[PDB]
């Protein structure tokens, strides 16, 4: 027998968003760590926001443990102040 | 929305410096005239 | 049973600006006022029975 | 028998800073071979060491409530 | 320009200084307080038994 | 006229090592005074005073001195 | 590691790129005033002739004003350093922070 | 235990187990409990002082009865109450 | 010049010595004849005067590295402020002694103190090191 | 509106403000009941009373300073204003809960007032030792308002441990590993799950006595069966790890406040730092009994204890060398914080090697509860915690109000604080050698002379308090508004802005994974 | 660090009084309570 | 507005209540031990229920009703719920602790022996027994409610969480029961001690658990649990697993090796 | 006894007070030169204008910040482990003695052969003999034979107190219920005094102990007298 609701039927909300969002391979609300590009400044690393500025962590070297932070700003990429790592912001909504 | 900024993030008021000057003052008085007060009301209950 | 779910996100997705501990009517405000009432009048009998207790009777 | 006794002497069965069981377990003792001699018509005499031993061992007011509840009948160890 | 330090560092340092040593040295000698001192090469012993 | 090279390089680390052996030198030479001026001390002091000490002779002098309740 | 030679063969080769951007250029100078060095007079020289490409004179007097800061109580260094430059700060027009009167506190 | 029963642990297996063992178990355990019940002999009545312990009276009664008090097994620092 | 608090996401301006290319230009915003300046600062730099140099430092730049690694007299306010605060804690220590504190018990006074040594030698307090050790018991004085 | 934001908050940046508010007031009581400590040991004699109104005076002095001054400042205070800003998160993960662990510290608080109001108050000392605390030699109702205090504080922090472990595990950045977070978040952590295992052990402990008091059980009296050194492992096993938990957000803070003031983008040995956080917190569960050596231990106990202890030297060295080592090179900027920071260094070296003599339990014989041990304390939790929230408050006051101290004033600060402390307690190591005992309200005439210096001392400490609360003031009336802040780039939590708006990270930062 | 200059500028006179008042907010009720403590204990 | 998963609650006063009804009810209990009245007591529970029931009604209506609660926040309340457990076990391992102190050591007040002199145990395999059957079957029942809740069997989760619910009321019972039969009261020394507060903070922790799993029961009855998302009804047996471990340990520690 | 500025500890009295004289000073020159060697690591870092600000290795430097620390704690425990099962050897004594802590006094039991028990009380500071100690001299001294081995048994009949003795390095908690042991010899004769060491109520500071030790005979006759 049945009767229980699934989460198709019964998610609301920001979870509905969530799921409905990862159904369709997306993230728009950053569950996942994006992969990074190659960084040169013909293939920067691509920022989503909501906004016309984002803070970016940078982490230079695999195993570092300082992460480098900075705003990243709508515009010409910017590069991180220590590796030198191309990002480049990419508004919308 | 609540009120953002210097001086507003705060449960008291720093528009007027001597405003707060009082309430600075019974705010830490207070704290370090209590246990004096408890040591006299202990002594005076015998 | 039914499941009347729907009907209750409908009821506390409603854009009325309430928060969630009183989105649920009226009655939530008079629950929310014994809760208070009964705290703050409960406290303020503590403090009475501290000043009682503090001295020898 | 082997006397010129100065004070309890080490205790291999109670080595430690803890010295509560050996006060204890000299009292049980004694009285447990003062009730046996008492009965069969001996000499309690054959339990001095014991008797000497905790007397030196345990704090008077031990022995005193100890003895108290021997005579009450609510002494809670064996003898 | 010269700031809060160039004009008054030298006067707060000299008063400051005289100010403290001075009360400090008035508190420890002239008020009654008993440091008690160690007694060895200070203190003639006196005889305290009796009969 | 023309000014000779320095040394450029590693001035930090050169200052610090020397400094930590300088450290390390005045270590042991404290050790040796702690040594020397307490420890050692400590030995003689307690060794020199019960070498020929007579314990008899105390107690006699602190019952002459009347410090007993036990001993007049 | 790399040698001595090596690192300042790295630096050198670092800031004699023709086309070095700005960012490059502080990127550079902020990184080696890093190291438990004074860098060597020809890393300095290649510097500030990427100062020149980029054309900002002040980056140059600000570069002589490191060398003379990472050199510390040594103060040997840097008249050194400075003999050692006079060719490039002539062929340049490069004025010492001294002969600008940026030593004055 | 020698119940093989495996492969997928689900719903079925877990009722199988609630009703064949678990259930069961507990109406032996009621059995043997309902056979051995009955009120036993109480022992008489010694005023031990590591017993019956009273360095403060109850909050309720009197203060001199526990809380889940049974006047039939439970005396008092003074005996079994009448 | 002028920064301001809605600016705290930009690159900013920093004198720091273990920093010293900073991310921005102290001066972003140029006048007619400072226009001029960057456009002449294109050619030869032998060509530029003194004050010319000076300008163009003073745009890139605010504070030079010996302006700002330059000493203060702050330690002298610090050192003598902080002798006056301890200075006025012996005021304190004064009003506590006269009107909180009664008289410390009679077994300080000068005749107590005199028999107490005695006895404490009599008992020979600390013979070895601490106190005794110091009497000289055949002289009948303190050992010098 | 103020209502819903200051007592109805979910934002862990105003509750970090009611914290910091709260340990700022508690620390006026504490102080005052230090004075009055010293008061009656300033000269000998008697002074208030005897040793009941004195020992709930001494008491009171260590639960104010403990639960409510310390913990609240380091943990509740620049806990949730810092961790989740330093790892990019919107809040704590309990937003809602972790308003009801403050708002059981003005309770729990009132409860100590209370016990102190009624009857005698509770003399029995910080520990609560039975038979003492008993209902025979302490009748009525102050020890067990005592007790209840204690539970409210212990629910408070076993709340916020359980919030700040699950917002450090939970919230992080996808891309950023638990080694990617800095030394203050896993000092934190750390503490939480210290508090999480250690605060049970006390609840049951102190609830065994409430009973005992009560209900008439016998846990802790012989009469019963029971034993009163139950009591003393039961509160010990607590009792050590709670003196980590005090000093571990110190340990972060120091971290940061050193790299910062160095001029540098990160701490030396990071992993190392780690390491050393983990294995202390590891080693401090299992070396109680080093406060009961002379309750009558087998000889082979009282050999472990003392070897189990002496091993915390290690992993804490590491830390101090690596704070050296990260000033080693650095661009030293010589501001207060960067002071209380160095002070700290050493003054913690002091005390922590006064416990590695306490350590031994030979030499702890003759040394235990005298006023050597009361040195060695005040040396770790008075020249080490204080420190450490002096030099953090200094430091961060310019994130968290948006103004800016006056930094001469702060340096005037530091160094009258300096002065008192040390001629405080540094003449308390010659009373405890000398056979001084602790809990004493008048002492020999022999020991006058350092009770009356150090009592002075405790009168310096007083000015530098006083002079806080001005320099406090001053900064809010001057309204010098924060421009600019340097090395953002390695000092996540300022990058918002000073102060940082209400909500942050509601877009979370961006770490790609390479 | 740098910040703006004061919004509003507390004088050295404004400091005297600040400082004045902090300090007798502590001083003054606890003087009070140990000046009387005589009379506390003694009835 | 935000581009992340979290939870930002709305202000809430149940925070504030809660703090307040522990003032009440340790400020009554005081009350209670030594002023004679149980006034502030009463009160303090009666704000206690309150808060409580207002509270994790927010939360109900955050997550079922407004949908909050995203696999991040799922996550999280997952790691809340296992550290609470972990302290409410260091909780009971001190009540453990003073058993074994205590029986391990057996002090001459009580004859120097273990059970004390006077002391008549209860027969483990009597009622014991039967209680530690009772709460091994309910995790046995309230496994089978999970499956089928994953396997979305409305009717059969209902079955097996009821069945649980009722021998957790028949544990309940039965314990009450011991507790008046019991020859021995938490007066009779050591032994009583440990008996009575170690089982009867168990006792306790068993009404909470089969409260937590009322509040489930009547949840799946409104369809508020889907066969995925359902941590309201995961963290009820979590904390009745933990319930029943500490009563293996308890029948083993108290009841059998230390009778 | 303390004397006026003392800054160390009191005259060993006992042969095991000598050892833990010894033992301090050992590890009382380690603790200052790790706390000198830490302020003049601290004054170095901070006295000089050269800079290296980039990513330093720590492996190699943490071996000794980790094997230098643990072969000093080697060093500390050698010492102090001997002295502390040294402490535990087996001793053969020739009289045993009990005391009883109480609020707020010390009672005492001498029962190897006769019954003789009497209790300690302060004496007031107003009834003091000129040269005697306010806050230590006893009404009735622990009169014990020097240069003989003594147990002492300790404990209490009210709360917890503890039978402190600082020359000879004594310390031994007073709890209700339980009979703790401790060994006591003296090698000299003399007055030697301590004091209640775990808080104990409103008396706690008054409570002293005054051991007197004289030889054999005298104390034979004393505790005759004492019967
Ligand atoms: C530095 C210490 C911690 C911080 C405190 C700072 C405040 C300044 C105080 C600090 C200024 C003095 C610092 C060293 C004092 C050593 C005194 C001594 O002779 O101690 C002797 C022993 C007992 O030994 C004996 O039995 C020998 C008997 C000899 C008697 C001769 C009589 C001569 C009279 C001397 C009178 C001295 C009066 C001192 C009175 C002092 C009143 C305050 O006492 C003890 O064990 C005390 C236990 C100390 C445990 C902590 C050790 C911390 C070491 C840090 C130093 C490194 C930095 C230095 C450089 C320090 C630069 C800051
Ligand atoms: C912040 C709080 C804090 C901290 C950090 C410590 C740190 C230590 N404590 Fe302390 N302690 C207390 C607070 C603290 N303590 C309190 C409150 C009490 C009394 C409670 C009461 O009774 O009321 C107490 C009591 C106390 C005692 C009991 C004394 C007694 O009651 O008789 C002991 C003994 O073992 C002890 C030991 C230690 C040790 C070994 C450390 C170590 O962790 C310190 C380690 C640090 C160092 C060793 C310095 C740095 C290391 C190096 C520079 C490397 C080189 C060093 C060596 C090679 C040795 N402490
Ligand atoms: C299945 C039954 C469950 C028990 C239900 C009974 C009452 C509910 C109270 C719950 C309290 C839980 C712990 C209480 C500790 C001891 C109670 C022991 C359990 C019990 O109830 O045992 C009874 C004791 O009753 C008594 O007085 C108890 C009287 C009331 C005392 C209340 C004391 C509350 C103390 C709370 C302290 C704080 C709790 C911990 C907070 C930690 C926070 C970090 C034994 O009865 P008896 O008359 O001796 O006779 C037995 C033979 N006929
Ligand atoms: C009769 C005597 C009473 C005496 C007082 C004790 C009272 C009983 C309290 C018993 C516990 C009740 C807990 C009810 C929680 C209900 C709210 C809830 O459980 O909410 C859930 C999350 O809960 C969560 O925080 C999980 C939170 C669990 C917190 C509670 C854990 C128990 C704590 C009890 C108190 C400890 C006392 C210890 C004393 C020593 C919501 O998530 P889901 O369920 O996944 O589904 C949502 C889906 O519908 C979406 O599709
Ligand atoms: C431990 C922390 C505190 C330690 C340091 C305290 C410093 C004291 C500051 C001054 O305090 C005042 O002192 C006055 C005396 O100078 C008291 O007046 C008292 O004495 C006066 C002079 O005799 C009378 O005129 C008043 O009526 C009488 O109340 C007054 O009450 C008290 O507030
Ligand atoms: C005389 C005395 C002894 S303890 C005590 C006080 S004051 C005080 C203030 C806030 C909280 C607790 C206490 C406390 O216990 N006063």
């Known amino acids: 027998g049945g009767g229980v609701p699934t989460d198709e039927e019964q998610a609301t909300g920001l979870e509905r968003e969530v799921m409905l969002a990862a159904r369709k391979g997306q993230d728009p609300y950053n569950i996942l760590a994006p992969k990074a590009t190659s960084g040169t400044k013909e293939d920067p690393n691509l920022v989503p926001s909501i906004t016309n500025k984002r803070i970016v962590g940078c982490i230079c070297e695999e195993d570092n443990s300082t992460v480098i932070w900075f705003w990243l700003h709508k515009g010409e990429a910017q590069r991180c102040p220590s590796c030198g790592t191309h990002y480049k912001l990419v508004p919308h909504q | 929305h609540y009120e953002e900024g210097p001086g507003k993030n705060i449960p008291f008021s720093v528009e007027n410096k001597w405003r707060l000057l009082a309430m600075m003052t019974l705010f830490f008085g207070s704290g370090f005239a209590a246990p004096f007060f408890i040591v006299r009301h202990q002594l005076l209950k015998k | 049973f039914e499941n009347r779910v729907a009907e209750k996100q409908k009821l506390f997705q409603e854009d009325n600006g309430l928060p969630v501990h009183l989105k649920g009517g009226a009655t939530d405000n008079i629950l929310y006022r014994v809760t208070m009432t009964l705290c703050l009048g409960g406290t303020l009998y503590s403090l009475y029975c501290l000043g009682w207790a503090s001295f020898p009777h | 028998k082997i006397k010129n006794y100065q004070t309890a002497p080490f205790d291999s069965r109670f080595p430690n800073q803890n010295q509560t069981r050996n006060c204890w377990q000299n009292y049980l003792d004694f009285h447990r071979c003062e009730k046996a001699m008492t009965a069969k018509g001996g000499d309690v005499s054959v339990c001095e060491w014991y008797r000497r031993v905790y007397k030196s061992l345990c704090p008077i007011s031990w022995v005193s409530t100890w003895d108290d509840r021997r005579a009450e009948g609510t002494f809670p160890g064996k003898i | 320009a010269p700031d809060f330090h160039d004009k008054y560092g030298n006067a707060v340092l000299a008063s400051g200084a005289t100010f403290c040593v001075a009360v400090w040295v008035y508190m420890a000698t002239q008020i009654g307080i008993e440091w008690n001192p160690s007694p060895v090469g200070r203190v003639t012993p006196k005889e305290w038994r009796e009969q | 006229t023309a000014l000779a090279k320095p040394q450029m390089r590693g001035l930090l680390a050169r200052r610090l090592r020397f400094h930590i052996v300088g450290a390390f030198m005045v270590s042991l030479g404290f050790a040796t005074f702690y040594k020397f001026a307490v420890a050692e001390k400590r030995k003689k002091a307690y060794a020199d005073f019960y070498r020929n000490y007579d314990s008899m002779k105390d107690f006699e002098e602190m019952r002459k001195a009347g410090i007993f309740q036990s001993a007049k | 590691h790399e040698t001595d030679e090596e690192f300042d063969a790295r630096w050198v080769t670092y800031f004699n790129k023709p086309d070095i951007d700005a960012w490059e250029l502080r990127k550079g100078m902020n990184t080696l005033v890093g190291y438990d060095l004074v860098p060597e007079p020809k890393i300095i020289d290649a510097a500030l002739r990427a100062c020149r490409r980029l054309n900002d004179f002040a980056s140059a007097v600000r570069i002589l004003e490191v060398v003379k800061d990472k050199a510390g109580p040594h103060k040997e260094i840097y008249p050194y350093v400075i003999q050692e430059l006079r060719p490039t700060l002539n062929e340049l027009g490069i004025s010492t922070p001294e002969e600008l009167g940026l030593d004055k506190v | ?82 | 010049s002028v920064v301001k608090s809605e600016d705290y996401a930009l690159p900013s301006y920093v004198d720091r010595r273990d920093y010293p290319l900073p991310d921005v230009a102290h001066v972003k915003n140029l006048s007619a004849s400072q226009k001029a300046l960057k456009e002449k600062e294109k050619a030869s730099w032998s060509s530029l005067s003194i004050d010319e140099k000076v300008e163009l430092y003073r745009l890139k730049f605010k504070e030079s590295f010996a302006e700002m690694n330059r000493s203060t007299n702050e330690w002298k306010t610090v050192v003598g402020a902080a002798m006056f605060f301890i200075g006025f804690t012996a005021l304190l220590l004064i009003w506590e002694k006269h009107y909180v504190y009664g008289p410390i018990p009679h077994t300080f006074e000068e005749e107590w103190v005199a028999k107490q040594t005695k006895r404490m030698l009599d008992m020979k307090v600390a013979p070895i090191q601490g106190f005794s050790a110091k009497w000289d018991y055949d002289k009948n004085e303190w050992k010098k | 509106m103020f209502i819903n934001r200051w007592l109805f908050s979910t934002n862990h940046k105003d509750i970090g403000t009611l914290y910091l508010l709260f340990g700022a007031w508690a620390g006026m009581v504490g102080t005052a009941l230090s004075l009055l400590i010293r008061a009656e040991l300033g000269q000998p004699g008697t002074l208030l009373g005897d040793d009941q109104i004195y020992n709930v005076v001494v008491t009171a002095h260590a639960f104010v300073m403990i639960f409510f001054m310390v913990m609240p400042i380091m943990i509740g205070g620049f806990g949730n204003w810092l961790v989740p800003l330093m790892i990019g998160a919107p809040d704590m993960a309990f937003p809602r809960m972790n308003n009801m662990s403050f708002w059981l510290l003005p309770p729990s608080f009132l409860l100590l007032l209370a016990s102190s109001m009624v009857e005698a108050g509770a003399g029995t000392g910080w520990t609560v030792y039975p038979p003492l605390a008993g209902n025979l030699a302490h009748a009525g109702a102050s020890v067990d308002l005592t007790i209840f205090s204690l539970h409210l504080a212990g629910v408070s922090s076993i709340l916020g441990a359980i919030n700040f472990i699950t917002t450090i595990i939970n919230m992080k950045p996808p891309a950023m590993s638990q080694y990617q977070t800095p030394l203050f978040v896993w000092s934190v952590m750390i503490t939480a799950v210290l508090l999480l295992l250690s605060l049970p052990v006390l609840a049951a402990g102190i609830t065994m006595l409430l009973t005992d008091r009560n209900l008439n059980t016998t846990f802790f009296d012989p009469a019963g069966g029971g034993d009163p050194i139950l009591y003393q492992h039961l509160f010990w096993f607590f009792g050590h790890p709670e003196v980590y938990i005090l000093i571990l957000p110190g340990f972060g803070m120091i971290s940061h406040i050193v790299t910062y003031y160095s001029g540098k983008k990160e701490p030396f040995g990071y992993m190392g730092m780690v390491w050393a956080m983990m294995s202390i917190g590891f080693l401090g569960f299992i070396v109680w009994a080093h406060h009961m050596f002379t309750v009558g231990m087998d000889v082979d106990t009282r050999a472990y204890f003392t070897s189990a202890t002496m091993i915390i030297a290690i992993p804490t060295g590491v830390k101090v060398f690596s704070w050296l080592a990260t000033l080693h090179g650095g661009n030293i900027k010589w501001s207060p914080a960067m002071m209380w920071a160095l002070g700290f260094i050493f003054l913690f070296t002091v005390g922590g090697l006064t416990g590695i003599v306490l350590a031994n339990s030979s030499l702890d014989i003759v040394l235990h509860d005298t006023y050597y041990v009361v040195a060695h304390f005040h040396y770790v939790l008075s020249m080490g915690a204080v420190f450490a929230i002096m030099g953090g408050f200094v430091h961060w006051f310019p994130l968290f109000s948006g103004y800016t101290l006056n930094d001469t004033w702060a340096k005037i600060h530091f160094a009258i604080m300096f002065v008192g402390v040390n001629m405080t307690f540094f003449p308390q190591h010659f009373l405890g050698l000398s056979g001084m005992p602790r809990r004493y309200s008048d002492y020999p005439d022999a020991y006058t002379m350092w009770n009356t210096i150090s009592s002075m001392g405790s009168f310096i400490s007083l000015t530098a308090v006083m002079l806080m609360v001005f320099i406090i003031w001053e900064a809010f009336a001057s309204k010098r508004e924060v421009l600019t802040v340097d090395l953002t780039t390695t000092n996540l939590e300022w990058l918002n802005g000073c102060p940082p708006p209400y909500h942050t990270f509601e877009e979370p930062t961006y770490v790609n994974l390479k | 660090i740098t910040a703006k200059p004061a919004k509003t500028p507390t004088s050295p006179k404004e400091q005297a009084i600040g400082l004045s008042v902090t300090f007798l907010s502590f001083l003054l009720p606890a003087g009070w309570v140990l000046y009387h403590l005589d009379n506390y204990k003694k009835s | 507005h935000q581009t992340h998963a979290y939870h930002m609650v709305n202000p809430s006063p149940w925070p504030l209540t809660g703090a307040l009804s522990a003032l009440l009810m340790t400020s009554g209990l005081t009350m209670w031990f030594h002023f004679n009245s149980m006034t502030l007591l009463m009160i303090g529970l009666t704000t206690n229920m309150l808060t409580m029931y207002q509270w994790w009604r927010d939360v109900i209506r955050e997550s079922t009703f407004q949908g909050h609660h995203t696999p991040a926040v799922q996550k999280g309340l997952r790691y809340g719920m296992i550290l609470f457990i972990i302290s409410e076990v260091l909780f009971f391992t001190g009540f453990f602790w003073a058993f074994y102190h205590s029986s391990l050591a057996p002090t001459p007040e009580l004859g120097g022996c273990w059970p004390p002199t006077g002391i008549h145990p209860l027969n483990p395999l009597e009622v014991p027994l039967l209680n530690t059957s009772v709460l091994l079957a309910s995790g046995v029942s309230i496994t089978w409610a999970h499956h089928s809740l994953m396997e979305g069997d409305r009717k059969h989760m209902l079955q097996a969480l009821f069945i649980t619910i009722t021998l957790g009321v028949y544990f309940t019972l039965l314990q009450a029961s011991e507790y008046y039969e019991a020859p021995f009261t938490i007066s009779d020394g050591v032994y009583g001690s440990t008996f009575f507060v170690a089982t009867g903070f168990h006792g306790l922790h068993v009404i909470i658990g089969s409260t937590f799993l009322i509040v489930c029961f009547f949840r799946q009855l409104k369809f508020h649990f889907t066969s995925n998302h359902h941590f309201g009804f995961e963290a009820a047996a979590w904390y009745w697993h933990f319930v029943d471990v500490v009563w293996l340990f308890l029948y083993v520690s108290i009841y059998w090796w230390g009778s």
Request: aromatic share 14%; charged share 15%; proline share 9%.
């Open chain 8, 1 to 82: 235990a020698a119940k093989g029963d495996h492969g997928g642990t689900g719903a079925r297996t877990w009722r199988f187990l609630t009703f064949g063992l678990a259930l069961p178990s507990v109406a032996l355990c009621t059995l043997n409990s309902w056979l051995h019940s009955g009120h036993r002999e109480r022992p008489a009545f010694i005023p031990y002082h590591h017993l019956r312990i009273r360095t403060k009276p109850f909050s309720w009664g009197d203060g001199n009865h526990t809380f889940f008090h049974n006047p039939r097994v439970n005396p008092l620092p003074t005996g079994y109450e009448k």
